[PDB]
Each structure stands twice: as C-alpha cells, then as structure tokens.
Symmetry: C3
C-alpha cells in the first residue's frame, strides 16, 4: 500500500519480475545493480574501475529518481567476482560515499549476472 515501485530510464530497464527499487516511505530497497549501460542494455567495456563507476551511476540514478540521495544509503551489499580487485573497486566507490559512508558487506562470489565483475545492492533511509 505505501509500497511504491521506482523506475527511471536513466538506469538499466528491468527485464522480468523485479523493480529497480521499492520505496516505502523514508526507506528505499534498491536491486543489485550490474555494470549495464542503460543506452545499450549490455555490460560496459572496461576493467573493474569502469564497471564499478557504471554500477554506482546506475544506483545513483535509481536513488535520485526515488527522491533519495547517495547520502541516504545506509547499507551496501557488494559482490565481487574477484576479491583481488577490491582495492581498485574501493578507489572508485570512495568517490561516491565521501562522508558518513554506509555500512558495507563485501564478499567474492563465483559468478554474477552477465559475467559482471561486480554487483551492488543498497538499502537507504532518509
């Protein structure tokens, strides 16, 4: 009832039974985003840094569409194909969460959708 679907054309269009995000009042639940360019609907060319920047940009557009801001991210779930890429991922991530950074979970998985190097999901509270 107070649950709302969030959609923006500025982040990858959901194909299937999920929403980019679900807003319930001052809480936002954001889907695990992968490095899809919304212009092509395919993974962006580049290394972990380019992919991380694409993911966080996807998340930023979703969060902003919902009336939230990156500052409202309380908890981030970070899934890496390769934990050795952590330092490089982290240097880009640090750009987006400079102050009052969210709680974070970081693990290495064996594979991601579209063979992504990284997927990030967040929960926000404003």
């Amino acid at each position: 009832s107070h649950m709302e679907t969030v959609f923006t054309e500025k982040a990858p269009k959901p194909v299937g039974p999920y929403s980019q995000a679900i807003k319930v009042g001052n809480t936002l639940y954001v889907s695990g985003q992968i490095p899809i360019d919304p212009r092509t609907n395919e993974i962006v060319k580049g290394d972990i840094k380019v992919q991380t920047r694409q993911v966080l940009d996807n998340i930023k557009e979703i969060v902003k569409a919902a009336g939230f801001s990156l500052s409202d991210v309380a908890m981030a779930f970070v899934f890496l194909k390769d934990m050795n890429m952590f330092n490089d991922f982290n240097s880009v991530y640090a750009e987006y969460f400079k102050d009052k950074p969210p709680a974070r979970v970081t693990v290495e998985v064996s594979r991601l959708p579209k063979d992504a190097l990284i997927e990030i999901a967040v929960i926000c509270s404003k």
Copy 2:
C-alpha cells in the same frame, strides 16, 4: 520488545539458533529458505524449477503466518548454485511476483546448505 518470532509448521522447522522470520511491526525479516519439504525435512526431488517452487512456497507460508503477503515483499536476495539456471528460476519466480515485483539481488554462490540449487531470503514491509 516489538520484535516477534514467526513460526509455522507449513515451512521447514528451524533446527538451531534462527527463526523462520522476525516481525517488527510492519517489517518482516525472513530467513534464507532452501528447497526443504517441511513434510520430510529434506530437499525436494527435482530440478531448479521444482526447487525454486519449493523455496517460494516456504517463503509464502512464512510471510502469511506473519500476517503479511507476497505482495509485501520489498527486497529479495537470491543465491543460485549455477547462474546458467537463472532463466528457469526466473520463469517460476515470475509466477509469485506478478505485480509491483520486489527489488532483487541475484548472485551465484559456490555452495548452499544441503547442496541446494537455490536459497532466497526476503525483507517485507506492509
């Protein structure tokens, strides 16, 4: 204090230090469910589709026991043993979340409890 344990005999009986779900007012936190038949306490026979249907049925019974409905699922965490099974998993999942589908996180893990093909945990808000 306003935290409540949720239990139903219609979903796998917890063996150990966890609850099927925890309800706090209009928010429900649901344990990662695996394809256990509550009748046998063992994994159901069948492929990813049969296992996915068992998991979602387990989640549905927990959610309903708690006074919630699948419509209240805001965020789903989906862990697959094999990302190549995604399309098949998704065809069953799509049956349970037809309208206003939840935010979703989907990754491939190296192994699950009882060597399950899939485990799903959800957060709901009503």
Copy 3:
C-alpha cells in the same frame, strides 16, 4: 539527517569508505564483520570456532556502542568460505543468540576479505 555513523575502538577500525554501522532511529545496519582482532588489525589465529567468536564479538561491540543489544538483531547474513564448517560455526553462533534468534541467511562464498573463513553482517531493530 536522522542517520548516524557508529564507531567504537572495541571493533575493527574502518579503513576506507564505510562505517562500522549506521543507526537510523530504532534500526541499525551493521557492516559485514570479519575475524579481525581490533588490537592487531589482523585476522585472529585459529579455526572456524575462534574466527566465528571474533566476528560475533566485533558485532556485539558495534551493536552495544550504538545503544542496541544482540537481542535486537533481526536478520543475520552469514557468509562462509566452507559450508562444511557450518556445524562448528553454528555451535559458537548459538551462544550469542539463545532466545528469539534472528532470521538468518547462510551461504558459501568463494572468498572473503583477508581470506577470512566467515563474515557476518546484521540488521537490528529495537
């Protein structure tokens, strides 16, 4: 705005763009903790049981610093390097959550930060 960063010297000091936890009113989001001894900033010597006890102690100190208690843990995300260690992990975990235990998600990942055997993140509500 009502979002607050949580920090205690009694749990591993964040190095980088994350907070040990984020408190928003009666909800706490806690980072995935690994078996770092805050005295050394390195992984503790020992098997899964010693590592699990270090992780849960880290989580306990964060939760207490925030004005919460382990009793307020609603949902735990448990990531194991090796699912065969589950029974041993569980025997220690059972010590910390004796009554009204949280909802739990448990999966095996291919690797963790610092090659940890286990990482745990929690969400609490008081």
